Amino acid sequence: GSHMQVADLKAFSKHIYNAYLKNFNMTKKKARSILTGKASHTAPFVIHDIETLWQAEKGLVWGLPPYKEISVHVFYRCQCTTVETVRELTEFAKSIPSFSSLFLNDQVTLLKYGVHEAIFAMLASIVNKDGLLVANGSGFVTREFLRSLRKPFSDIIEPKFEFAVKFNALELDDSDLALFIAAIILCGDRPGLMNVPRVEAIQDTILRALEFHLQANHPDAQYLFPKLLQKMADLRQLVTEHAQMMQRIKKTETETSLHPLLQEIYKDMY
Ligand SMILES: Cc1cc(SCc2sc(-c3ccc(C(F)(F)F)c(F)c3)nc2C)ccc1OCC(=O)O
């Protein structure tokens, strides 16, 4: 038959975890070691105002468009970060069993409508209630500083903190997140898919693997699997809202540029 047993699902999970470790430089384990002070290096440089942002741009190890103003500059660094994670997600996807065998067009479609949900999920790993890590972990920008940016740029990031804090309360590790992100990517609900049943099948397999994985890895947790399915739904709404805010910037901040790679992702949604 075609219905995988527990042993098959466990092996499937291990392969996805390996593809994860292979393709992501900033894992939650690494991020947490930095954020909890376990790292052997000194605490990250803190960006909490204009003076420190300027200093970080001069002393922190990171081709942006010409400087215009603080809020727009930060907007550009958001884009750059996003582009890098998109490249990692693409390589991660290619390494997930049964992704590379989908129609090329379906692979493209899945990444296009999937990357942002995945980005916001993984973002939680490098975030706490007070800020997030930048410059590959060597910097830390405060939530308060991002709130100080002028509208509409301040309105973009705050929603992600709200989501991340609650998401982090679930206490997932990298092994869990590997399956979660795979499930987000291999999503049979995306528009323009040629072979929906194939994608549906793969997603369901990933989800079953995830349930069994959570059982062993978090034996004492309650309703963790259902909670994560809800998180997936929450991410869809987060992205819709984020895309709306990006469109507003596109129409009102005509002096602000958008990376071509991100332009295509958002191309056919407005
Ligand atoms: C505008 C925008 C915001 C987000 S919210 C998640 C954030 S915040 C962030 C960041 C914030 C401040 C700095 C600073 F100050 F420079 F240190 C920094 F380096 C990095 N990086 C990310 C991923 C996500 C995407 C996006 O546009 C691109 C798209 O939608 O594709």
Author numbering: 167 to 228, 234 to 441
Authors' own words:
There are three peroxisome proliferator activated receptor (PPAR) subtypes termed PPARβ/δ (hereafter δ), PPARα and PPARγ with different expression profiles and actions.
The crystal structure of hPPARδ-LBD with GW0742 was determined in the P212121 space group, at 1.95 Å resolution. The final model consists of a monomer in the asymmetric unit, composed of residues Gln171 to Tyr441 (hPPARδ numbering). The hydrophilic head group interacts with arm I and the hydrophobic tail, comprising the thiazole and the fluorine substituted phenyl ring, is positioned mostly in arm II. In total, GW0742 made 29 ligand interactions with PPARδ pocket, including three polar interactions and 26 apolar interactions. The other carboxylate oxygen contacts the His287 side chain from PPARδ helix 7. More interestingly, the GW0742 hydrophobic tail occupies the entrance to Arm II, unlike GW735 and Rosiglitazone tails which are directed towards Arm III between the helices 3 and 2̀. Comparison of amino acids that form the PPARδ Arm II entrance with equivalent regions of PPARα and PPARγ revealed two substitutions which could potentially form barriers to GW0742 binding and could block access to PPARγ and PPARα Arm II; δVal312 is replaced by bulkier side chains αIle339 and γMet376 and δIle328 is substituted by the bulkier methionine in both PPARs (αMet355 and γMet392). Thus, the presence of bulky residues at positions 312 and 328 reduces PPARδ activation by GW0742 but does not permit PPARδ activation by ligands that bind other subtypes.
